[PDB]
């Protein structure tokens, strides 16, 4: 692969990236709930 990474490295890398994305998504989901409770857009 054209990043030179071994597969082992890409698996390691993806686990950190997705854990960051799950954390970011969790805060966003709460933020939309709080705003929808505060002031629904539907």
């Amino acid at each position: 692969g054209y990043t030179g990474l071994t597969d082992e490295q890409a698996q390691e890398l993806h686990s950190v990236y997705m854990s960051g994305l799950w954390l970011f998504s969790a805060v966003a989901i709460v933020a939309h709930l709080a705003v929808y409770i505060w002031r629904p857009w539907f």
Binding site: G1, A10, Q11, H14, Y17
Partner: protein, 55 residues
């Protein structure tokens, strides 16, 4: 769904990480500015009425 990690064999994480970082910021700012310009959703002008700060 399991094999997605092989995307990091294709793109340099430095480039992707910076690119998604700039994307998320510029998208978030754009949305907050759409809301501040929307009178029904500008929280600063809402709370000004709710607490009669307009006087």
């Amino acid at each position: 769904m399991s094999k997605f990690y092989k995307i990091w064999m294709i793109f340099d994480p430095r480039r992707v990480f910076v690119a998604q970082g700039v994307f998320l910021f510029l998208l978030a700012v754009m949305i907050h500015l759409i809301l501040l310009s929307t009178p029904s959703y500008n929280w600063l002008e809402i709370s000004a009425a709710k607490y009669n700060r307009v006087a």
